[PDB]
Structure 1
């Protein structure tokens, strides 16, 4: 059986946007949608499958139970809940941590033995929990890490220099948030590193690097303020990841990888460039970032760890 089967848990804005991006790109052969709200999951499957005759790939789409994970190649997790009046932000994390653990159990219980792709927030945390609960090797639990932040980073640079975003090569490291690292020292465009555009070409200036960096950090806020939520950007990032896994591409993507000394941190999943293939994450690419960039990464991972301890299971 060469048929590729992907299960998407959670049929909200994110799950359905991922599914649609996958169908239009023709990435998988079978998409199973799972959601506590069975009617919603069915309504989505119906709608997503309607236009297939006009598509470039013949993808099967249907709503189902966890039994379907038994022979799935990979399971994408996006299921979660909203902020409820009467609960703190941490309360919410423990809630999504509980939900993610419940799902991970049902999935494993079906005899699933593929690869996990964690997209629900907070990704780094839930990725770590999925790892513990699943009992699977770290490399087979892939979080979305900083793929969205990285694509936004490239978008901003492309807009500034008027170049194809696919021609920008740089990354956003760490955990998504105020402490994410915009690794300018390791960002290039056509072979020319950003700091060369600055120092030697004088095409950009330090201030620009700061402005661009902030835009990435504030991207979710600007979007959420205008359309209530963000999901298209993440839909494409997740599909990119699934693509690299299913096609054993051995491509580099800044996903959530289990660190074991790289960047000077260990025992946590965070966003860093990594080689992705059919077995998950093969290895991390340890960039020799500047002391300022690394101190910012350390800080980023520190905050990550604080929260992780507040929910982590022994």
Structure 2
């Protein structure tokens, strides 16, 4: 035919997260075509060159530096945005989505930009799409941070720790202590969790910003989608009347696979319920009413 595609990823925002995300995919031999769009086109051109010159060296993808690219674009990762956030960001977002949609996109959205559970809801409101097709970065890196520290405590391998962080990607997130195992053996640790939650601030203070952490987390959900994993990942899924909530996007165990979210799991919560999670859901449910507008 012409020269095909099949698994294309369009990253809106070639900046630290965008860039480190691409480099992840690239070095992981995850996508076929990888298109980069930034409103500072000189920067996307520049990274696209940089990616292409050592490509020879990895295991094979094609890279390219508008939105007429979100054609048969499988997945769109939206890493753009400001740094009064919420309604600046919803404003920026109001344009990114309107335009990917214009080329009649069929795909999936993966939103990495803080305040994410909020921008993830907005992405859904602005595109049309069933809410199983609009995913949010969520507490994915939070539960990675978590699983790394506990993994270090027991000196086992983080991939044998099974412990979640759910709620809002931020201050209100709570850990799910009652169903945290190491292998199949249930379990200071309240300290560990305080280091999991002030972790951003902590890395930001000594190097100005976070970006490898997440990209890696952004590279896994991509894995789950592009490969139909049916992975249980803790993302920013839309609540259904599942933890008790009816119209919010929050961080929760969801099953991932090629066609977006399959199903949100309800882990059974302590009385760490309509308390930490309700509290959390509530904090957000209201930024959505307080926020929006322009």
Deviation at 1:210, TM superposition (A): 0.7
In the aligned structure 1, how far is the partner of 2:72 from the partner of 2:208?
36
Give the aligned partner of residue 35 of structure 1. 38
Which whole-Å CA distance do the structure 2 matches of 1:291 and 1:153 have between them? Answer: 21
* 1:142 alignment counterpart: 135
CA distance in 1, matches of 2:143, 2:93: 25
Measure the CA separation in 2 of the matches of 1:294 and 1:231: 32
CA distance in structure 1 between the partners assigned to 2:165 and 2:27 by the alignment: 27
Q: CA RMSD in A?
A: 1.3
Match of 1:231 among 211, 221, 224: 211
Displacement of 1:166 after TM fit?
1.1
**Displacement of 1:312 after TM fit?**
3.4
| Separation of aligned partners in 1, 2:277 and 2:53 | 45
Q: 2:236 aligns with which of 251, 256, 280?
A: 256
TM-score, scaled relative to structure 2: 0.96
Select which of 179, 182, 204 maps to 1:186: 179
SS of residue matched to 2:24: helix
Show structure 2 runs of 5+ residues with no match: none
Q: Deviations over 1:53-77 (max 9, x none)?
A: 1102x111111x1000011001000
**Does residue 74 of the first structure (1) align with residue 54 of the second (2)?**
no
Matched, 1:49 2:57: no
Taking structure 1 as the reference length, what is the TM-score of the superposition? 0.90
Equivalents in 2 of 1:105, 1:182: separation in Å? 36
Per-residue CA deviations over 1:86-112 (Å, capped at 9, x if unaligned) read: xxxxx1210011111110000000111
Deviation at 1:311, TM superposition (A): 2.1
The alignment covers a number of residue pairs equal to: 291
The equivalent position to 2:160 in structure 1, one of 127, 147, 167, is 167
In structure 2, the residue matched to 1:277 is 257
- What is the 5 A alignment of 1:1-314? 3-56=6-59, 58-63=60-65, 65-82=66-83, 91-194=84-187, 208-312=188-292
Runs of 4+ off more than 4 Å: none
The 2-side partners of 1:294 and 1:230 are apart by: 31
Contact 2:176–2:272 at 8 Å: present in 1 too? no
Q: Distance in 1 between matches of 2:5 and 2:49?
A: 25
CA contact (8 A) 2:5 2:33 kept: no
How far, CA to CA, are the matches of 1:227 and 1:80 in structure 2?
20
Q: Is the 8 A contact 2:6 2:74 kept in 1?
A: no
1:203 corresponds to which residue? none
Query: d(CA) in 2 for partners of 1:276 and 1:140?
Result: 10
Report the CA distance between 1:294 and its aligned residue.
4.4
Larger % of helix: which?
Answer: 1
Provide the C-alpha distance between the structure 2 equivalents of 1:266 and 1:233, rounded to a whole number of angstroms. Answer: 31
Q: Do 2:78 and 2:111's aligned partners in 1 also have CA atoms closer than 8 Å?
A: yes
Q: Provide the secondary structure at the position in 1 that maps to 2:81.
A: coil
1:151-171 per-position Cα deviation (integer Å, ceiling 9, x unaligned): 001011011111111111110
Report the Cα offset of residue 257 of structure 1: 0.6
Q: 1:200-241, CA deviations, whole angstroms, 9 ceiling, x for partnerless residues?
A: xxxxxxxx1210110100110110011000000000001100
